[PDB]
Amino acid sequence: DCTLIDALLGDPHCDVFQNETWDLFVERSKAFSNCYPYDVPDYASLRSLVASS
Amino acid sequence: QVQLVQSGAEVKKPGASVKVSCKTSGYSFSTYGVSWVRQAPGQGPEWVGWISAYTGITDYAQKFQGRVTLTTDATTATAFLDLRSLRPDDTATYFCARDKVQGRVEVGSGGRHDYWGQGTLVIVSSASTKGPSVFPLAPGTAALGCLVKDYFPEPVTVSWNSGALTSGVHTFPAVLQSSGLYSLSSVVTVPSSSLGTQTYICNVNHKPSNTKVDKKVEP
Amino acid sequence: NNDNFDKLYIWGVHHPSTNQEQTSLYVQASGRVTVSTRRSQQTIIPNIGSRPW
Amino acid sequence: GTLEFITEGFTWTGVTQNGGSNACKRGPGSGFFSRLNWLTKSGSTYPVLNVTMPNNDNFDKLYIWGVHHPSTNQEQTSLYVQASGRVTVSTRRSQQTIIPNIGSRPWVRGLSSRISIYWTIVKPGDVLVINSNGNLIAPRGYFKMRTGKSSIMRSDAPIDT
Amino acid sequence: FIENGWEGMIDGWYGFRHQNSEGTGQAADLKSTQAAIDQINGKLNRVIEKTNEKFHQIEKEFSEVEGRIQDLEKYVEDTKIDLWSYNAELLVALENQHTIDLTDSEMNKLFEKTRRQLRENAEDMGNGCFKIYHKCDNACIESIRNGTYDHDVYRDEALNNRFQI
Amino acid sequence: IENGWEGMIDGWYGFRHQNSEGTGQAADLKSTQAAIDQINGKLNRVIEKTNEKFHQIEKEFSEVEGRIQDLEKYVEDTKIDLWSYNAELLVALENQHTIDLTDSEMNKLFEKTRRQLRENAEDMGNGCFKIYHKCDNACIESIRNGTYDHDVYRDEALNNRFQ
Amino acid sequence: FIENGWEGMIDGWYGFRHQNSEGTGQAADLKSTQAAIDQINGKLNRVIEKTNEKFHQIEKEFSEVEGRIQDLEKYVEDTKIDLWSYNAELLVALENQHTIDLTDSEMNKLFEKTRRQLRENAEDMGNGCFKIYHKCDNACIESIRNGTYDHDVYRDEALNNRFQ
Ligand SMILES: *[C@@H]1O[C@H](CO)[C@@H](O[C@@H]2O[C@H](CO)[C@@H](O[C@@H]3O[C@H](CO)[C@@H](O)[C@H](O[C@H]4O[C@H](CO)[C@@H](O)[C@H](O)[C@@H]4O)[C@@H]3O)[C@H](O)[C@H]2NC(C)=O)[C@H](O)[C@H]1NC(C)=O
Ligand SMILES: *[C@@H]1O[C@H](CO)[C@@H](O[C@@H]2O[C@H](CO)[C@@H](O[C@@H]3O[C@H](CO)[C@@H](O)[C@H](O[C@H]4O[C@H](CO)[C@@H](O)[C@H](O)[C@@H]4O)[C@@H]3O)[C@H](O)[C@H]2NC(C)=O)[C@H](O)[C@H]1NC(C)=O
């Protein structure tokens, strides 16, 4: 249910992802945010760079 | 299923030559060549040559060329290896193995040394053969054994109860003596209660000297 | 946007030459324009100064 | 492919020129970047500067200029009087306006304050207009621009003949 | 020469069909068969030999319209695809034209081998057969096939049926 | 055939004979079309309609932008350089082939003709045949059109050749 | 035909080894040697015909992590490399398969030239030799090698040793 950026920031339902690792993270169509409404100037860059960390 | 049974160990003297058989089965002999690899004790494997059972073609390693001749007999389904002018260098264990695919479509390289012979020891020495003496290795865990002493050449095969006792057995590397002969130990650790009920067997067998001596041990 | 297609909105923001002009037109000493959708957000603060004629 | 600089006589009236900090020491005493001009207060005034410099030449002029970000308000007022500065460089086609931000940055070589560097290319026939009531790091002129084979590379290999 | 090819030959890929007194019969030449195979095999192995690995790349699908950067990210990935696609069309085409000429030459070669062997004891009928001009029983036939036919032996017999009657 | 024939306008490959009845010429239309059909089909593959592109990136620029522009120019140059190589290589390959294709076609016609004459003629060495018998014009077209029965002129030819 | 090839031939690339009454001997065919060379030469010249020049390009190493633009600058340059690399692997492979078939055909062609020359005075032994069926002394041998052997001359001699 989480996007990557939501696990990063720590949306409540994305808590189970804390301190996680991956070779390939898989964002689902179904996913949603459910916290304070935000936006990320240069969203795609942050997503990309965390993804490859 | 699929297998390669090779001939028993031969022993030959510096001049002479040798022939080693490799019997195949479980696959159609003629759609696959055969690779031969040898192994000088303690060193790693070195390749000898290859022959096709489809086309009769051969490729010997240039190190041996002349001395070595590969053949195949389709009726019996067997590949043969003949090595001439044996040096003591050539004392090694000799393996055959399925290799290349012939006739059939193609690939990729799925074997290419699929399955191997159990290996067949060749000893090139000028010394005499001598059969082993078998002495009991007289005995809460407890230990017993056999001592296979003063024989030549290798190998000696030792088992216990036709192979009925496999567990907790350690058969050691033969050790060369300054007397030129070989000595070999084999031991078993068993529970020290079962003594009246059980007994034990030394399936000692030294086949360069046709000596099957199954000789026994007790306290 | 209750329609079934993407709507493109073109808008802009005025940069006056003097403060006297800023006050004549928009009263407040310093303006601010903030256009936003549910996902995105965008905010410009007009800059006052002389440009070439 | 060139740092061919050409000085122009900007006339910055009512402000003191050529400031320099101990961070950027030239010789025994203190100085600044050689192709930039640190305009600060004169008396207790910083006028609204409003200069202009055409391009009657037949080539593109590259102007490097910048804007000072002080660490404290005290330092902002000492230098530029006005509580909040503003720098606006513009040509007939383009326009560009920075508003310096006051705050503490990490200490670098004696200073907690900083300078942002901006460029403006002004083409033949066009005209450059600098305007500012504080915090300007002004240019002394332009660099000639040309297009060509030139380039740059990171390497530690030495040069032989 | 052979304006056709033989269905029902399942011994191998190239072969011999003879007819003599003892009767007709067939048999495949295994050496020139494997010769073709080994080439195709190796050519095929080089094509499918292990590909690339690629991990974190650029994005290639997009939800919003971004203009300039996105326009470039899609041009880059399309330009890539179009080239690799050309490479693959050309590769297969070349490889195939070759695989054909390779196998046509193999047949061709076996025929010559067989002609050089018969020397002056036989003639090329014109359809990739030979009219051998002597009593060639089944022993003699495998003698040809397995590369041992001594022409110096049937020379006189053959030579005379050819130039007389 | 160290050379080739100017003035052959019947086709692309042919026969030039000389006998008692006189000299004369005639083209082999089958092996001619054989060459053509290959060149034709090869050529058709190459020019099989290229591909359509619409809104791409910008490739000319008025002002200097640095990084993005540098990349937009590098991308398009890199593209060009590759496609250019593809085209140079293509043509080269295709040509070397188109040559070897047509040289083999001539070559093949010659063999066809040799297998036909069997033991009634010899290869002069310049891609001609010395036919060893009286081969009048009927006999000649019999060769050209694939019907020359050697078993017929065998004895005549065989004997002029050897005795 | 020739199972093998001759070491110790240093006069040229293709040659003739004869044996007659006057003794054995060897000699290279220069014309079909240069024929092979001239092709390899020209093929080779086209490959190394001087490459491109390039000057101010994009950056390809990077110190800090920038995300999107940098990912693209790295993808562009990698994509380039991979393709050019394929071009070079394929080139060499093709060129080589050709350079082989070119030289195998050159030998092949010399042999035929020589067979058409001997016409009916000799037979192909099967290993790419000829059994010439007449007294062919050293003058006669070079007459073959240099393209002047008149068969119409030794016809009768040869023809008769061959047949009875
Ligand atoms: C700060 O910076 C710049 C340069 O130092 C400056 O830009 C120039 O200023 C003058 C004054 O505003 C203007 O010039 C105009 O140019 C055209 C010439 O082609 C004229 O038609 C205009 O003239 C008329 O307006 C006159 C007013 O005096 C009347 O006499 C008459 O009716 C004319 O129609 C006008 O003079 C222009 O503003 C610019 N030009 C450019 C290219 O920037 C800016 O004015 C400076 N401002 C301050 C406040 O210091
Ligand atoms: C906001 O936060 C920043 C960071 O917390 C803070 O800046 C820090 O201030 C101290 C001084 O107040 C500075 O530390 C410097 O570090 C170097 C070491 O590499 C020293 O050489 C300097 O020391 C000298 O000055 C002394 C004063 O008498 C001498 O005794 C001494 O021998 C040296 O001459 C110097 O102190 C530095 O300015 C930072 N540190 C960092 C990591 O940024 C700042 O105080 C805060 N802002 C405000 C307005 O309070």
What domains lie within chain D, and their CATH numbers?
A: 1-157 (3.90.209.20)
8 Å CB contact of G124 and E120: no
Question: What angle do the packed helices F29-46 and F67-117 form, to 10 degrees?
Answer: 170
Kindly calculate the radius of gyration of chain E based on its CA atoms and give it in whole angstroms.
Answer: 28
Token match 């000699």: residue?
A: G27
Q: Is the CB of D78 under 6 A from ligand 1?
A: no
Partner-chain residue, chosen from G75, G86, G94, that has the shortest CB–CB distance to E58: G75
Question: In D81-109, which positions are buried (b, 16+ CB within 10 angstroms) versus exposed (e)?
Answer: bbeebbbbbbbeebbbbbebebeeeeeee
> Best substitution site from D112, D113, D114 to test ligand 2's pocket, by max atoms within 8 Å of Cβ?
D112
> Best substitution site from D107, D109, D111, D114 to test ligand 2's pocket, by max atoms within 8 Å of Cβ?
D107
Residue F64 with chain D: CB contacts under 8 Å: 60, 121, 145
SS3 track for chain D: CCCCEEECCCCCCCCECCCCECCCCCCCCCECCCCEEECECECCECCCEEEEEECCCCCCEEEEEEEEECCCHHHHHHHHCCCCCEEEEECCCCEEEECCCCCCCCCECCECCEEEEEEEEECCCCEEEEEEEECEEEECEEEECCCCCCCCCCCCCCCCC
- C-alpha pair distances (Å), F149 with each of B122, D82, E163: 68, 116, 17
Largest CA distance in chain E: 93
Give yes or no for a contact between D18 and D36, defined as CB atoms under 8 angstroms apart: no
Size of interface F-G (CB pairs under 8 A): 35
Mind listing the domains of chain B with CATH numbers? 1-126 (2.60.40.10), 127-219 (2.60.40.10)
Amino acid at F156: E
What size, in residues, is chain C? 53
- As a whole number of angstroms, the distance between CA D77 and CA D2 comes to 38
8 Å CB contact of F71 and E71: no
Query: Side-chain half-sphere of D117: how many Cα atoms within 13 Å?
Result: 7
State the residue range of the domain holding G39.
1-164
Closest ligand to C-alpha of residue D131 is 1
- As a whole number of angstroms, the distance between CA F74 and CA F15 comes to 58
CA F111 to chain CA mean position, Å: 15
G17 burial via Cβ count (<10 Å: 0-12, 13-18, 19+): exposed
Give yes or no for a contact between B108 and E40, defined as CB atoms under 8 angstroms apart: no
A 10 A CB-CB count for D152 gives 7
Residue E162 with chain F: CB contacts under 8 Å: 119
Q: G157 touching F, CB under 8 A? A: no
Residue D70 CA to ligand 2 center (angstroms) comes to 16
What size, in residues, is chain G? 164
Token match 């020129």: residue?
A: D17
Q: D102 touching F, CB under 8 A? A: no
- As a whole number of angstroms, the distance between CA E153 and CA E140 comes to 11
User: Which residues, listed in sequence order, are joined to residue B169 by a DSSP beta bridge?
Assistant: B188
Tell me phi and psi for residue E5, to 5 degrees: -140, 160
Tell me phi and psi for residue B32, to 5 degrees: -160, 130
* Angstroms from G58 CA to nearest CA on chain F: 6
- The closest-lying atom of ligand 2 relative to the alpha carbon of residue D71 is 49
* Angstroms from G53 CA to nearest CA on chain D: 10
Chain breaks in chain B (C to N over 2.5 A) after: 139
For chain F, the straight-line distance linking the first and the last C-alpha, in angstroms and rounded, comes to 29
Give yes or no for a contact between B12 and B86, defined as CB atoms under 8 angstroms apart: yes
Q: E64 touching A, CB under 8 A? A: no
8 Å CB contact of F71 and E72: yes
The CATH number given to whatever domain includes residue F127 is 3.90.20.10
> Could you say which DSSP state residue A23 is in?
S
Which tokens is E92 given? Answer: 């297969």
CA F102 to chain CA mean position, Å: 2
DSSP for F5-38, written as a single string: -TT--S-SSEEEEEETTEEEEEE-HHHHHHHHHH
- H/E stretch holding B141 reads strand B141-151
Strands F129-131 and F121-123: antiparallel
DSSP for G35-99, written as a single string: HHHHHHHHHHHHHSS------S------SS---HHHHHHHHHHHHHHHHHHHHHHHHHHHHHHHH
Closest ligand to C-alpha of residue D49 is 1
Give yes or no for a contact between E130 and E74, defined as CB atoms under 8 angstroms apart: no
Q: What angle do CA B129, B131, B134 make, to 5 degrees?
A: 155
Q: G119 touching F, CB under 8 A? A: yes
Token match 């014009």: residue?
A: F137
Give yes or no for a contact between D82 and D134, defined as CB atoms under 8 angstroms apart: yes
Give CB contacts under 8 A, 24+ apart, made by G58-62: G58/F70, G58/F71, G58/F74, G61/D154
Enumerate residues lining ligand 2, CB below 6 A: D 72, 104, 106-107, 112
CB within 8 A of G147, min separation 6: which ones? G117
Helix, strand, or coil (residue C16)? coil
What size, in residues, is chain E? 165
CA D134 to chain CA mean position, Å: 13
> Could you say which DSSP state residue A39 is in?
-
Amino acid at A53: S
8 Å CB contact of C15 and D129: no
Question: What angle do the packed helices E138-145 and E68-118 form, to 10 degrees?
Answer: 140
> Could you say which DSSP state residue B30 is in?
G
Give yes or no for a contact between B145 and B34, defined as CB atoms under 8 angstroms apart: no
* Angstroms from A5 CA to nearest CA on chain G: 14
User: Which residues, listed in sequence order, are joined to residue B78 by a DSSP beta bridge?
Assistant: B23, B73
Amino acid at B49: G
CB within 8 A of G59, min separation 6: which ones? G73
Give yes or no for a contact between F131 and F150, defined as CB atoms under 8 angstroms apart: no
Residue D109 CA to ligand 2 center (angstroms) comes to 11
Give yes or no for a contact between F122 and F132, defined as CB atoms under 8 angstroms apart: yes
Residue D52 CA to ligand 1 center (angstroms) comes to 12
Chains that touch G (3 or more CB pairs under 8 A): A, D, E, F
Question: What angle do the packed helices G68-118 and G30-47 form, to 10 degrees?
Answer: 170
CB within 8 A of B218, min separation 6: which ones? B136, B139, B199, B200
Q: Is the dihedral of CA D34, D35, D40, D42 positive or negative?
A: positive
- H/E stretch holding F79 reads helix F67-117
Helix, strand, or coil (residue E79)? helix
What size, in residues, is chain D? 161
Which tokens is D12 given? Answer: 């910055």
Give yes or no for a contact between D14 and D47, defined as CB atoms under 8 angstroms apart: yes
Kindly calculate the radius of gyration of chain A based on its CA atoms and give it in whole angstroms.
Answer: 11
Counting the structural domains of chain E, the total is 1
Q: What's this structure's resolution in Å?
A: 3.5
Picking from E104, E100, E134, the residue whose alpha carbon sits closest to that of residue E119 is E134
Which tokens is A30 given? Answer: 């179904």
Nearest chain E residue to F56, by CA:
E75
| Best of C34, C36, C41 to mutate (most A CBs within 10 Å, chain A) | C41
Helix, strand, or coil (residue A48)? helix
Give CB contacts under 8 A, 24+ apart, made by E87-92: E87/G83, E87/G86, E87/G90, E90/F90, E91/E47, E91/G90
- C-alpha pair distances (Å), D29 with each of D21, D25, D26, D32: 9, 6, 6, 11
Residue G136 CA to ligand 2 center (angstroms) comes to 106
CB within 8 A of C26, min separation 6: which ones? C14
Helix, strand, or coil (residue G117)? helix
Q: Do chains G and C touch (3 or more CB pairs under 8 A)?
A: no
Largest CA distance in chain D: 58
- As a whole number of angstroms, the distance between CA A34 and CA E154 comes to 98
Picking from G93, G97, G99, the residue whose alpha carbon sits closest to that of residue G41 is G99
Partner-chain residue, chosen from E55, E56, E59, that has the shortest CB–CB distance to A44: E59
Q: Which structural technique was applied?
A: X-ray
* Angstroms from B33 CA to nearest CA on chain E: 12
Q: G86 touching F, CB under 8 A? A: no
- C-alpha pair distances (Å), E94 with each of B36, D7, E156, F45: 38, 65, 49, 13
- As a whole number of angstroms, the distance between CA A42 and CA E60 comes to 17
- As a whole number of angstroms, the distance between CA E123 and CA E141 comes to 16
- As a whole number of angstroms, the distance between CA D32 and CA D22 comes to 9
